[PDB]
Paper text:
MUTYH is a clinically important DNA glycosylase that thwarts mutations by initiating base-excision repair at 8-oxoguanine (OG):A lesions. Improperly placed adenines within pro-mutagenic OG:A base pairs are removed by the adenine glycosylase MUTYH, as the first step in Base Excision Repair (BER). The [4Fe-4S] cluster is coordinated by four cysteine ligands within the N-terminal catalytic domain, while the Zn(II) ion is coordinated by three cysteine ligands in the interdomain connector region (IDC) and one histidine within the catalytic domain. A loop made by two Cys residues that coordinate the [4Fe-4S] cluster, referred to as the iron-sulfur cluster loop, mediates electrostatic interactions with the DNA backbone that are critical for recognition of the lesion containing substrate.
Numbering used by the authors: 8 to 289, 293 to 360
DNA sequence: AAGACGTGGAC
DNA sequence: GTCCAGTCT
């Protein structure tokens, strides 16, 4: 494999075409690490405003570590896959507590941190510290599957390990961070899933898939399974003084530690009744439902139905619930589904 | 291994 | 509608 003629060419292309993204302003390990977590299964264009806002709020690792969990989650509100930021928050706290605020440059110690998998180890340490670890994301797997005509299913962990070995074989130990970011940028800008720009492509000469005319069929990936449908009844409960009842989800599993309007997973069966029974347990009367809408997750679809109701206080509002004046709802981090619940509630109200 | 785990944007 | 931008369990 003509590594040098591939490398020199990839990196020259990158020097010319590299996007001036916010996290490329410097090689600060904290800012890099934040961006690499935010970018997990999230497009660059989506990340940009979140990254800018997050770094303004949490300018250093210490700032992030010292912040309240609710503040950090609100900074992630709407980005999706919220355990990323809970893991990052813990990883920074551990980096502060254990390492005094210096991001480990040891791969095993960096990898020991929550949220830091093989991609994030390679991305951060190669960029920040020059450590020659591979940084294999979807872009890289697309590029390598085409270059070396690798047909193994990339859903398999073992496939990713094969790509990691290829990177180690063709890397540029001279400039590891720049090699890694260049391979990713190639997949971002050129070696795209549909209609890849093979003719423009710098490393076209080395592409087995190009020769064979099969780039549009790679990488190989098993079609996704159809997802579960889940009915969800949601109560929007306001008292005479405009405050609304919300509750914090447990830290285990779906939308962990986010706030929501109280909801009961129904089986499509007696929703309004299930909601009234749910609140009584942990005084309230619900009207007819005002809207029904769906909300997609990667692995299930919520079918939401919103029931207005009136709240009469008969005791202390006990955890996990909170009585929030309308003007303070904006302080809490809500999943997009419940942001829409509230929007629909307000539209109906008017 | 393979399901859990969000969301928006482009086909 | 499908596809697509990592890590924990
Ligand atoms: S020639 Fe086409 S398929 Fe091959 S690396 Fe370039 S863009 Fe991807
Ligand atoms: Ca790890
Ligand atoms: Ca890509
Ligand atoms: Ca739970």
């Amino acid at each position: 494999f003509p590594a040098r003629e591939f490398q020199r060419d990839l990196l020259d292309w990158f020097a010319r075409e590299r996007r001036d993204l916010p996290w490329r302003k410097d090689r600060d390990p904290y800012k890099v690490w934040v961006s690499e977590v935010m970018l997990q299964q999230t497009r660059v264009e989506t990340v940009i405003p979140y990254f800018e806002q997050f770094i303004d709020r949490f300018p250093t690792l210490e700032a992030l570590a010292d912040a309240d969990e609710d503040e950090v989650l609100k900074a992630w509100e709407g980005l999706g896959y919220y355990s990323r930021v809970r893991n990052l928050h813990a990883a920074v706290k551990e980096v502060k507590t254990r390492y005094g605020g210096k991001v480990p440059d040891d791969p095993d110690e960096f990898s020991r941190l929550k949220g830091v998998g093989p991609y994030t180890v390679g991305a951060v340490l190669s960029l920040a510290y020059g450590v020659p670890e591979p940084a294999v994301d979807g872009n890289v797997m697309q590029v390598l599957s085409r270059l070396f005509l690798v047909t193994d299913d990339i859903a398999k962990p073992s496939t990713r390990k094969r790509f990691e070995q290829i990177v180690r074989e063709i890397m540029a130990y001279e400039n590891p961070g720049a090699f890694n970011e260049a391979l990713i940028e190639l997949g971002a800008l050129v070696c795209t899933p549909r209609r890849p720009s093979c003719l423009l492509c710098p490393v076209q000469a080395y592409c087995q898939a190009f020769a064979e005319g099969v780039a549009e069929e790679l990488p190989v990936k098993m079609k996704k399974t159809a997802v579960k449908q889940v009915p969800l009844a949601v109560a929007v409960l306001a008292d005479d003084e405009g405050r609304v009842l919300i509750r914090k989800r447990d830290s285990t599993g779906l939308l962990a530690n986010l706030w929501e309007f109280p909801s009961c997973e129904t089986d499509g069966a007696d929703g309004k009744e299930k909601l009234e029974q749910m609140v009584g347990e942990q005084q309230v009367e619900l009207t007819e439902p005002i809207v029904s809408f769906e909300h997609a997750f990667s692995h299930l679809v919520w079918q939401l139905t919103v029931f207005p109701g009136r709240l009469v206080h008969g005791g202390p509002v006990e955890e996990p619930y909170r009585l929030a004046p309308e003007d303070e709802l904006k302080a809490y981090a809500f999943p997009v589904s419940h942001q829409r619940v509230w929007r629909e509630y307000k539209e109906w109200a008017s």
